Amino acid sequence: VYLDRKLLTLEDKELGSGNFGTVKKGYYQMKKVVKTVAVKILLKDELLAEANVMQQLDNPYIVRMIGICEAESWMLVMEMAELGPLNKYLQQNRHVKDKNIIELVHQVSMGMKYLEESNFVHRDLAARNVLLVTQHYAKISDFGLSKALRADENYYKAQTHKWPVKWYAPECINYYKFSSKSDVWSFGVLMWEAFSYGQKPYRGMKGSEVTAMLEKGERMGCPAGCPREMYDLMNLCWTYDVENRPGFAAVELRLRNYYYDVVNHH
Ligand SMILES: Cc1nn2cc1CN(C)CCOCCNC(=O)c1cn(C)c3ccc(cc13)Nc1nccc-2n1
DSSP: OBOOGGGEEEOSSOSEEOSSOEEEEEEEEOSSSEEEEEEEEOOHHHHHHHHHHHHHOOOTTBOOEEEEEESSSEEEEEEOOTTEEHHHHHHHOTTOOHHHHHHHHHHHHHHHHHHHHTTEEOSOOOGGGEEEEETTEEEEOOOTTOEEOOTTOSSEEOSOOOOOGGGOOHHHHHHOEEOHHHHHHHHHHHHHHHHTTTOOSSTTOOHHHHHHHHHTTOOOOOOTTOOHHHHHHHHHHTOSSGGGSOOHHHHHHHHHHHHHHHHHHO
16 A cells, blocks of 8 residues: 555656646566556545545456555556557547457446446546556546445435536436446446547537537437447437436446457458
8 A cells, every 4th residue: 555665766757747746657666576657646635535446446447556655745656557548549549440449448348347336436437537558458547536335325425516527427417416327427428439539529518508418318429430339329328317327237238249249240
């Protein structure tokens, strides 16, 4: 959990930045090998809560935390996913095949099926928060808004609203209620982003105009080259009523079966 700063070597140039601070590449000295790491460098309570969520998770499709370090700044040290965010990768590699996109979004659904089984809500599931280990291996990152659900409740109730509204289900916006089914809605938006090679969803629209569009029963169109089966799955994730929206066990199964059909056709 608490890492030794003497064993961490940070690179000078950052990989990326945000309002939180920076993400830098580093190296952590192990009992024998060196481990390449991604380090989120800073607020403190939020980073510690994010670290506490990551320490409880154990799944091949979720970013693994090595530990935290309290040195010049507070640091969250994670296993490195070298290829970076999925949205940026697809913007820069617009000839990635449709079968490969299905493979990656199916990996995300497996990580989310595990989070749902673990009763954690992600609350920020978007293509910018998926990282690539390789072109054929995605991991979910960014547990800063994540919550462990109480034993007696199926949702987390936020007290007041900095929210990624274009990824949020109607019950999040209207009742401040976040469940695994709310993450399924975000997963539908993530699928649209991935099949659109990292394009932003609801292009040119304000959050209130997105709410108005969804309330009229309107949904984003089918991205170019996206198979009908995958657009149908996106629309099922965007089921307005939480009760009738599928959970990640059903979503992952649909994706798994379609992925095997495409692997067979190829
Ligand atoms: C919370 C968290 N973890 N993290 C990143 C975040 C932060 N998220 C993504 C939200 C903010 O994104 C904007 C900042 N941009 C980048 O992080 C990255 C940019 N390039 C080119 C990368 C290459 C590898 C990589 C990360 C990045 N690798 C990695 N591997 C493991 C974890 C990690 N990044």
